[PDB]
Structure 1
Amino acid sequence: DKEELVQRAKLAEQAERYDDMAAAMKEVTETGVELSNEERNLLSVAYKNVVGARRSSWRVISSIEQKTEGSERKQQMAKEYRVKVEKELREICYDVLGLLDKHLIPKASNPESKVFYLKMKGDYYRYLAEVATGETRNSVVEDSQKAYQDAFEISKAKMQPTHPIRLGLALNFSVFYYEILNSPDKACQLAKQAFDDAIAELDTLNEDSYKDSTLIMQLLRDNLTLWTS
Structure 2
Amino acid sequence: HMDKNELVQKAKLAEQAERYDDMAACMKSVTEQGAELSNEERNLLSVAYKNVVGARRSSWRVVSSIEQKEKKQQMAREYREKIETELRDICNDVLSLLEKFLIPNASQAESKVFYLKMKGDYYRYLAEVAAGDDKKGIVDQSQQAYQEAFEISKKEMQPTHPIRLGLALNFSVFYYEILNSPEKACSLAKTAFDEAIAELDTLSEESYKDSTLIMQLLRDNLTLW
- What TM-score does the superposition give when structure 1 sets the normalisation length? 0.91
Give 3-state SS (helix, strand or coil) of 2:185's partner: helix
User: 1:44 maps to which residue?
Assistant: 46
User: 2:133 maps to which residue?
Assistant: 135
In the TM superposition, residue 225 of structure 1 has moved relative to its aligned partner by: 2.0
Gaps of 5+ in 2: none
Q: Which amino acid aligns with 2:160?
A: T
Determine what percentage of the aligned residue pairs are the same residue: 81
User: 1:72 maps to which residue?
Assistant: 71
Matched, 1:58 2:60: yes
2:103·2:116 contact (CA, 8 Å) conserved in 1? no
Q: Which amino acid aligns with 1:131?
A: V
In the TM superposition, residue 145 of structure 1 has moved relative to its aligned partner by: 1.0
User: 2:80 maps to which residue?
Assistant: 82
1:161·1:200 contact (CA, 8 Å) conserved in 2? no
Q: Which amino acid aligns with 1:144?
A: S
Aligned in 2, Cα 1:78/1:162: closer, same or farther, shift over 3 Å?
Answer: same
Q: Which amino acid aligns with 1:64?
A: I
Give the stretch that moved more between structures: 88-97 or 127-136: 127-136
Give, in whole Å, the separation in 2 of the partners of 1:87 and 1:24.
22
Give, in whole Å, the separation in 1 of the partners of 2:52 and 2:202.
32
User: 1:112 maps to which residue?
Assistant: 110
Gaps of 5+ in 1: none
Give, in whole Å, the separation in 1 of the partners of 2:44 and 2:19.
13
1:163·1:204 contact (CA, 8 Å) conserved in 2? no
Give 3-state SS (helix, strand or coil) of 2:104's partner: coil
Q: Which amino acid aligns with 2:21?
A: D
In the TM superposition, residue 222 of structure 1 has moved relative to its aligned partner by: 2.4
User: 1:213 maps to which residue?
Assistant: 211
Give, in whole Å, the separation in 1 of the partners of 2:116 and 2:61.
25
Give, in whole Å, the separation in 1 of the partners of 2:199 and 2:63.
43
In the TM superposition, residue 209 of structure 1 has moved relative to its aligned partner by: 4.1
Q: Which amino acid aligns with 1:63?
A: S
In the TM superposition, residue 208 of structure 1 has moved relative to its aligned partner by: 6.6
In the TM superposition, residue 12 of structure 1 has moved relative to its aligned partner by: 1.5
Q: Which amino acid aligns with 1:26?
A: K
Number of residues paired by the alignment? Answer: 223
- What TM-score does the superposition give when structure 2 sets the normalisation length? 0.92
Deviations 1:88-131 (A, max 9, x none): 10011111111221221332212201111111011001111222
Give, in whole Å, the separation in 1 of the partners of 2:202 and 2:80.
44
Give 3-state SS (helix, strand or coil) of 1:105's partner: helix
Deviations 1:118-168 (A, max 9, x none): 110110011112221211111111111111111001110111212111110
1:205·1:211 contact (CA, 8 Å) conserved in 2? no
Give, in whole Å, the separation in 2 of the partners of 1:77 and 1:201.
55
User: 1:3 maps to which residue?
Assistant: 5
